[PDB]
Amino acid sequence: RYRVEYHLKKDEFIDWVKGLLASPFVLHAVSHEGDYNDDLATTQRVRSQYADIFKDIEGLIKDKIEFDSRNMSLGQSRLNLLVPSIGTFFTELPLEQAFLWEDSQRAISARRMVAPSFNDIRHILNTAQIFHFKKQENLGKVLRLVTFDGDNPVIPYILKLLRCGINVGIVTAAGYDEAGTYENRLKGLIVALHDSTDIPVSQKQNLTIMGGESSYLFRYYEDPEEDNFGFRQIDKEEWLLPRMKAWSLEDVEKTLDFAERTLNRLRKRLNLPSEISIIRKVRAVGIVPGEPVKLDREQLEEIVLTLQNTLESFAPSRRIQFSCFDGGSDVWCDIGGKDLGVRSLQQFYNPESPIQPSETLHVGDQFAPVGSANDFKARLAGCTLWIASPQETVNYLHRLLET
Amino acid sequence: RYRVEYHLKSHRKDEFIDWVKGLLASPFVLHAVSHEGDYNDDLATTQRVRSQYADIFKDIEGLIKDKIEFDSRNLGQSRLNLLVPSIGTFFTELPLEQAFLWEDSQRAISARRMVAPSFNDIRHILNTAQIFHFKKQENLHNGKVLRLVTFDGDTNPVIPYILKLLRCGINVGIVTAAGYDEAGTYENRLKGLIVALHDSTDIPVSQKQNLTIMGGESSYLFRYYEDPEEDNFGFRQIDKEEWLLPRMKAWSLEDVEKTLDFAERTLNRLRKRLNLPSEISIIRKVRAVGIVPGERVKLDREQLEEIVLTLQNTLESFAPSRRIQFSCFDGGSDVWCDIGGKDLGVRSLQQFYNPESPIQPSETLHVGDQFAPVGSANDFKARLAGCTLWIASPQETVNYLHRLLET
Amino acid sequence: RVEYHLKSHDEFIDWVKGLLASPFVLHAVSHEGDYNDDLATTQRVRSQYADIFKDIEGLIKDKIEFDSRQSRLNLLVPSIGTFFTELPLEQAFLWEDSQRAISARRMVAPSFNDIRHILNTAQIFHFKKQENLHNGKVLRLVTFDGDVTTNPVIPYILKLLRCGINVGIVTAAGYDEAGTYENRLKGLIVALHDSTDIPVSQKQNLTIMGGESSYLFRYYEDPEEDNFGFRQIDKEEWLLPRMKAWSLEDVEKTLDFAERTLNRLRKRLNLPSEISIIRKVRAVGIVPGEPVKLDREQLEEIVLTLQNTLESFAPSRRIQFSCFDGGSDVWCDIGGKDLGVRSLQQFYNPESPIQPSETLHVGDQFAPVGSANDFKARLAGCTLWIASPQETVNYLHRLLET
Amino acid sequence: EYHLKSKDEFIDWVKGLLASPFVLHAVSHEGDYNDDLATTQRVRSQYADIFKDIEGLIKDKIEFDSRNMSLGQSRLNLLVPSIGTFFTELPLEQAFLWEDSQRAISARRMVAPSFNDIRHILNTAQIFHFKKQENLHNGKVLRLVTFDGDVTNPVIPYILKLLRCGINVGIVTAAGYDEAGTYENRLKGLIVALHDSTDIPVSQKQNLTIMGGESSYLFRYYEDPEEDNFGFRQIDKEEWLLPRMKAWSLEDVEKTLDFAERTLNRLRKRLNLPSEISIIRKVRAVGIVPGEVKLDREQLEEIVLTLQNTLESFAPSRRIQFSCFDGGSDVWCDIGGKDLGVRSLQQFYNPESPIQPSETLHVGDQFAPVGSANDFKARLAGCTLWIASPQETVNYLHRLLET
Numbered sequence A: 001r002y003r004v005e006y007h008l009k010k011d012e013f014i015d016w017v018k019g020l021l022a023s024p025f026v027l028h029a030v031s032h033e034g035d036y037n038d039d040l041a042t043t044q045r046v047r048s049q050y051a052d053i054f055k056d057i058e059g060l061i062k063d064k065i066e067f068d069s070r071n072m073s074l075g076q077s078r079l080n081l082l083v084p085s086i087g088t089f090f091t092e093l094p095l096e097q098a099f100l101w102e103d104s105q106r107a108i109s110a111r112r113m114v115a116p117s118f119n120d121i122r123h124i125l126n127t128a129q130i131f132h133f134k135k136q137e138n139l140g141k142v143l144r145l146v147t148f149d150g151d152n153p154v155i156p157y158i159l160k161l162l163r164c165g166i167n168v169g170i171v172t173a174a175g176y177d178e179a180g181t182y183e184n185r186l187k188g189l190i191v192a193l194h195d196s197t198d199i200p201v202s203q204k205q206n207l208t209i210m211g212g213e214s215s216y217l218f219r220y221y222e223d224p225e226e227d228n229f230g231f232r233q234i235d236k237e238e239w240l241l242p243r244m245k246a247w248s249l250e251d252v253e254k255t256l257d258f259a260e261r262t263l264n265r266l267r268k269r270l271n272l273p274s275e276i277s278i279i280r281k282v283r284a285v286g287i288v289p290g291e292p293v294k295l296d297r298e299q300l301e302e303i304v305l306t307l308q309n310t311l312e313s314f315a316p317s318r319r320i321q322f323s324c325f326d327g328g329s330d331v332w333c334d335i336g337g338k339d340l341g342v343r344s345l346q347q348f349y350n351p352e353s354p355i356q357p358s359e360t361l362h363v364g365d366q367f368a369p370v371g372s373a374n375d376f377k378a379r380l381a382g383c384t385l386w387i388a389s390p391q392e393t394v395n396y397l398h399r400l401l402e403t
Numbered sequence B: 001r002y003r004v005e006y007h008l009k010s011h012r013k014d015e016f017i018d019w020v021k022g023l024l025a026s027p028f029v030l031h032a033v034s035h036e037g038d039y040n041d042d043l044a045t046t047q048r049v050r051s052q053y054a055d056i057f058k059d060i061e062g063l064i065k066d067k068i069e070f071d072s073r074n075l076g077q078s079r080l081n082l083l084v085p086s087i088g089t090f091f092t093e094l095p096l097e098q099a100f101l102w103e104d105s106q107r108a109i110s111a112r113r114m115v116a117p118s119f120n121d122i123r124h125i126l127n128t129a130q131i132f133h134f135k136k137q138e139n140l141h142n143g144k145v146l147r148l149v150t151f152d153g154d155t156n157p158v159i160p161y162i163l164k165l166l167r168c169g170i171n172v173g174i175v176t177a178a179g180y181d182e183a184g185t186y187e188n189r190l191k192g193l194i195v196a197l198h199d200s201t202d203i204p205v206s207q208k209q210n211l212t213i214m215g216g217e218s219s220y221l222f223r224y225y226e227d228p229e230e231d232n233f234g235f236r237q238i239d240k241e242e243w244l245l246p247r248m249k250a251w252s253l254e255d256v257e258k259t260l261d262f263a264e265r266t267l268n269r270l271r272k273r274l275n276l277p278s279e280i281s282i283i284r285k286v287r288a289v290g291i292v293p294g295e296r297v298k299l300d301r302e303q304l305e306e307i308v309l310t311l312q313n314t315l316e317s318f319a320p321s322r323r324i325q326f327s328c329f330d331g332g333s334d335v336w337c338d339i340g341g342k343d344l345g346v347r348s349l350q351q352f353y354n355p356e357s358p359i360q361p362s363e364t365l366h367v368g369d370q371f372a373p374v375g376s377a378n379d380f381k382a383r384l385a386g387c388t389l390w391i392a393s394p395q396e397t398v399n400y401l402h403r404l405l406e407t
Numbered sequence C: 001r002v003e004y005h006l007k008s009h010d011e012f013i014d015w016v017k018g019l020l021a022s023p024f025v026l027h028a029v030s031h032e033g034d035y036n037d038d039l040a041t042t043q044r045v046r047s048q049y050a051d052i053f054k055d056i057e058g059l060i061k062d063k064i065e066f067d068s069r070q071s072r073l074n075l076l077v078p079s080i081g082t083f084f085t086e087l088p089l090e091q092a093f094l095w096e097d098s099q100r101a102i103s104a105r106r107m108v109a110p111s112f113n114d115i116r117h118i119l120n121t122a123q124i125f126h127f128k129k130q131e132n133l134h135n136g137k138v139l140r141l142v143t144f145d146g147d148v149t150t151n152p153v154i155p156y157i158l159k160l161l162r163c164g165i166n167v168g169i170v171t172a173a174g175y176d177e178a179g180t181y182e183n184r185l186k187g188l189i190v191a192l193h194d195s196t197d198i199p200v201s202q203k204q205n206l207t208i209m210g211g212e213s214s215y216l217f218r219y220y221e222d223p224e225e226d227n228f229g230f231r232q233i234d235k236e237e238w239l240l241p242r243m244k245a246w247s248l249e250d251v252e253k254t255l256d257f258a259e260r261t262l263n264r265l266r267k268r269l270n271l272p273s274e275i276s277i278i279r280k281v282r283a284v285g286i287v288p289g290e291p292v293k294l295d296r297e298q299l300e301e302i303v304l305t306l307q308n309t310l311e312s313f314a315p316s317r318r319i320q321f322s323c324f325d326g327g328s329d330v331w332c333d334i335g336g337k338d339l340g341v342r343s344l345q346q347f348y349n350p351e352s353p354i355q356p357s358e359t360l361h362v363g364d365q366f367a368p369v370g371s372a373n374d375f376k377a378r379l380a381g382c383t384l385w386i387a388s389p390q391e392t393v394n395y396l397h398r399l400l401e402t
Numbered sequence D: 001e002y003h004l005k006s007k008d009e010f011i012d013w014v015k016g017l018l019a020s021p022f023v024l025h026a027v028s029h030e031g032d033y034n035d036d037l038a039t040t041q042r043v044r045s046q047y048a049d050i051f052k053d054i055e056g057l058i059k060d061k062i063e064f065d066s067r068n069m070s071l072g073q074s075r076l077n078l079l080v081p082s083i084g085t086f087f088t089e090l091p092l093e094q095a096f097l098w099e100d101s102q103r104a105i106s107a108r109r110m111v112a113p114s115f116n117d118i119r120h121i122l123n124t125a126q127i128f129h130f131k132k133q134e135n136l137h138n139g140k141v142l143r144l145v146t147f148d149g150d151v152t153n154p155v156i157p158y159i160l161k162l163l164r165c166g167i168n169v170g171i172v173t174a175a176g177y178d179e180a181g182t183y184e185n186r187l188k189g190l191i192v193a194l195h196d197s198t199d200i201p202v203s204q205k206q207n208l209t210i211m212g213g214e215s216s217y218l219f220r221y222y223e224d225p226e227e228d229n230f231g232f233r234q235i236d237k238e239e240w241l242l243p244r245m246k247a248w249s250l251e252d253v254e255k256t257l258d259f260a261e262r263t264l265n266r267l268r269k270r271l272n273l274p275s276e277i278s279i280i281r282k283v284r285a286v287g288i289v290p291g292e293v294k295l296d297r298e299q300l301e302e303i304v305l306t307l308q309n310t311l312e313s314f315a316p317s318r319r320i321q322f323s324c325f326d327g328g329s330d331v332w333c334d335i336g337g338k339d340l341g342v343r344s345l346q347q348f349y350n351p352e353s354p355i356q357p358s359e360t361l362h363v364g365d366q367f368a369p370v371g372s373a374n375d376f377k378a379r380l381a382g383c384t385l386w387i388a389s390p391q392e393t394v395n396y397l398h399r400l401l402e403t
């Protein structure tokens, strides 16, 4: 009833839009008995009601952009007063056009029983972002950086992104400190890249892997001098953000030491199978599946929550920044985070003119309680796409890259 | 936000389990979370917490049994029915504490200090308890052993256990919302099962032939067959008179077809209004009508829900359709409107296998993945006909059947 | 749907409130500091609100038409009561908006009471429009509540009677004698007696229904004795056909079990001895002693226990029954509030019973006060949700004005 | 933030805890009129143990709360985040057992332990604590009792007993009136009773104080022996003002009040308020008051919310502290707060040894959405009692003062 365990463990903006859309739906749309005559009329009016609302939100976003532009780098944006937990909008969003296009496909205005869904709005928001970047191309601030979530139909589109002179970064929560591992699982991307004759080697090496959220950076290399292809680790000094440089190594190791100890305690208390392994690396410590032998989500969630709470009461850990991740059957504790990794890549690709958030798009699937490495953090560093299927990713990439 | 559209859709969620979750949360926050951070004696805390959880489950056991006795009456209500008003009938005693202690070993529930006992935890405990019961009745003098196991249709590690079930002398039926009126389709769909059963040496033919397919929810019945003169196997259609329940035989054909005709017209209206692509096609059969994806192609989720909600509401205002029970299903990316229901299908099978001594609900177990808003063909209706297992993964089915059939 | 009170267990108003929340956030809160746009902001907000109410009017009309023969509104709001009359929602909003300045608010959304006020104003508006036409269904019966075991409403009751409108007071007290209600309503009968401007014939159209629908009394003025007061109308005249088939033994068995149940509750709750149990012909109840009163938790415990207990008692379900814990009293009565209103509708004109569309129940018991709540009165006719005596007076003034 | 819809999380948290034994051991046993004593006894035992557990949690929080006080958090703060500060130990079980005897909470089978049940228990426990310290050797006994004075009798005797018992009594109001006359005219009878009461020394008589504008004006009862002059006398600010308040800029104070006065004048035109409603401006406060004419609770809350959020975006107001009150028909904007008001009185009575929060009990009837001057703010300065009825105040004071 009243959950006493509620605070021990949703996108408000989207639910907000859903509420605004539901009011005309229940009043005008819910007119089920109707196809005898007035359902063209009902659909038409309902479509207009929805379109108007999205157009109103368009202006609210643009007002927020302007307010945030001048007053940031204490007032509040209108939209921020309406939606307190809303994230920054680095780009304009043609919501009305996006809706009308999606309504063409899925006939949302033509429904009388099923209100505009969370997925409906999510698709509109994603379509709007893509539409924005395509608009700049036929003029603006075009898309310079696309990032993906590591922790196949997508592989070709990655290659063409690179050919179109767009930097591609793969952000993973994996704490592996050796290139070799990433070469072993990103095999297909590496060899298909390598084996492709079209791409100049310059564009070929614009592919990067930001491991440990923002702990390790690897870049693609092609040395057919040796016919050696794969990923080369980049020295910290080139890609490390200034604030991260200030972190003491002692606090880093102390943080990782305390984390690894906490993991082992959790292991014993939870009496986890011995096939479950705790892996410690240079900038990361994590727990991994075994043999077949996996971990329950409650166990994964217990681990992340325990790690976050303990470390947040650990002084070395607060003098730095850390992230936790429990997406798959693995829980990773890494130094840094999603936002830091994306912004590091922005500076890395062009130090003289760092890639702006307005020119950055993070196609991510970790908009969930996957930990502090959630893709909501990525909204701090740039524009994002919210994908729920690999096909969704391909669809979005296809329309983006369509001439 | 006050969702003004809430009541337009089905938002059924197992109140009994949520009720159990709420009870377990009180010892959790006062004993588990109150000793979060305690580096020393974790074992003591886990033991006290587990004991508190176990006591609660044993209390619920008692409530369940009392209800079973108070439902043997037939208007008062069981004490449990007062606590949880939407509770279903318990055809069988549930060893909940034993099931909790077993799952607590696997899932380590009592050891957690941050994450409370979950819905899935209770679901696992409830399912394990249902299995544990039937395993107890096997050796028992006057125990009611499991006679019928039912599955949901609409290579595969379930097939061996289905074969093992049949060999163990247990009747197995598959209830599919598909409305196809030919045995050929189900032979094509379930070719993996029929081939393995055909190739199974350890199972006598009488036990093999104890495999049935309930086409529609209760519209068509098919039985496995193995010709003794020729190497021909597959599925045979059974005449209506042998398996059709009395009330179903009382149903008028004209109302049946009026319903299906109305449903078919309603489907094409929806097709136009939602401007669905031309390959989405609408298929009409003898006792069922449905809309299926085509190729060049598929239907959105919300569109599928729009269809079943439309069909259900419209037909529930159709007089011939109230004289004759019907069902809708949008689980896959198809929507099928079938005459009858899942409840009817299970009890039809209960009668068919042994007409003279019909299989009781206490001897029936439906393994279902459709305990969801999948229309009126949901597995909550199967709780009317007998005991159920709530499965969320195919691996759960395998594990559940493994525990049951383990010697 | 639990029968036991764990937390604070009208959906239509909350549904409307949710609707009104959309223009509030998108068009009002967005303009909190736009102090020169106050004219345009308020105008747009007022139109947005008014458009919603106009839309709900249509859905209500659809519900009425459908119920004349679920409705969309029933699908949207499953706990919605029947609308016996159409309501002018848009105008009611605009009128109340002038007084309350709802559209000018940027920090506070349209409230529950805002809508309740608008709904009440709409109901009164409807009758007034019907009135001037006279052609339409005019208000013939107004019912009030005095259910519990200084008043400016009295002159308006008198004005209602002089306007040829029948006035009934429905009460859950369940006392079986006229003298008690004469004393409780002394101010009303004195004022009515002292009124020279009202014909005795019209004075006689004042009735009181005790025990929800168990006892009926009428106002009388006889020249011979030269007094006045209340005379109990015989059962044959006002009893509904459903109630006539009710067996006396079931009635007695119901009350006897209820009285027994009350006595154990006294024991177990260790209630003070000053607390007494009163038994009447068609009612049994627990009343506060002497100040010695009962906690609301205790009163709720009593009503919930009785309802659950009696609804599992075969004689009681061959019967209808009601419980009421409004004040610091709990009464178990044979009748029901809907039955009382329906009985009065027949009593005044047996040939052509007063239609629900010509009936208005001004009630203050739209609360968890047991099965005797005023939501039951919505079954028998139109209603008015009042929170203050001033509200009643205000609503009655608008109703009876030129 | 804006308000769409309409308590105390700690009480709700305890209610949810007590609800679990209720459903299983009480609701289940309805219809069982035999065995009811046994059922009641067990149910009582279950409830009591929960309270004893919560007692322990409080003692732990208090000791953790010795770490800082004007990282991490108490386990109670994790479970209930919006929980206030407990300056004293609370005998919850003893209080429950007493309240269960009076209210028969454990005997109920259909009605769970209510919000009011717990509230009474918490209030009783607070009283119980101070009574034991009166017993104990040199225990931190009650030294300051504060009351609310509202804005534009059985309680009077108990105040006198408090004063005669050597307990300092203060009355805090949101009224912005800066003249002693208004309060001699508002607190008549009490002054007369104190003047007429021969059984009280005038030294103890003077321990009665009035805090106006929450913490803006201080008036102390005076009684000249030879000239028959009695009433309230304003105390000079340097004597009772807290240091932080002394450092406040008069300009910022004035600028804040002037902004509020214009905001108030804006609101009355916007809301088209009647001309009978008058706006009152004082030295340390500005307010809106009813006419000869009254204001809706929506209008009252609109004004408070508007004023509150507006001034929070006003820099001079940020550099000061302000409070708002809409309990009565009036809406007052006063410089300071109830918290600052109580604490100022704590130093005023005895500057060499300021009265501690553990020695201060605030009996208040404003634990509601009354604005920033609510009694929840008083929990920052000391112990409190939640009052819903005037008779509750009388009964509570009686039990506190009984011997």
Ligand SMILES: O=c1[nH]cnc2c1ncn2[C@@H]1O[C@H](CO)[C@@H](O)[C@H]1O
Residues within 6 Å of the ligand: A011, A012, A013, A014, A085, A086, A087, A088, A089, A125, A126, A129, A379, A382, A383, A384, A385, A386
């Ligand atoms: O609260 C938010 N919800 C959705 N998108 C947001 C939000 N805040 C900032 N953005 C941005 O809006 C675009 C919509 O797809 C994305 O670029 C997302 O990052």
Ligand SMILES: O=c1[nH]cnc2c1ncn2[C@@H]1O[C@H](CO)[C@@H](O)[C@H]1O
Residues within 6 Å of the ligand: B014, B015, B016, B017, B086, B087, B088, B089, B090, B094, B126, B127, B130, B383, B386, B387, B388, B389
């Ligand atoms: O409300 C219910 N929730 C869970 N199971 C129920 C319910 N009602 C009857 N049963 C039965 O209890 C067993 C354990 O899940 C299953 O057999 C189920 O069908």
Ligand SMILES: O=c1[nH]cnc2c1ncn2[C@@H]1O[C@H](CO)[C@@H](O)[C@H]1O
Residues within 6 Å of the ligand: C010, C011, C012, C013, C079, C080, C081, C082, C083, C119, C120, C123, C378, C381, C382, C383, C384, C385
């Ligand atoms: O769910 C309802 N809420 C409020 N009023 C209702 C409802 N159902 C029917 N009516 C009627 O609407 C008028 C306005 O208050 C009243 O006449 C009431 O009886």
Ligand SMILES: O=c1[nH]cnc2c1ncn2[C@@H]1O[C@H](CO)[C@@H](O)[C@H]1O
Residues within 6 Å of the ligand: D008, D009, D010, D011, D082, D083, D084, D085, D086, D087, D090, D122, D123, D126, D379, D382, D383, D384, D385
């Ligand atoms: O969240 C709280 N709820 C109730 N009381 C609290 C809370 N926080 C601190 N105290 C203190 O506990 C005593 C009992 O009510 C009071 O002294 C109150 O100020």
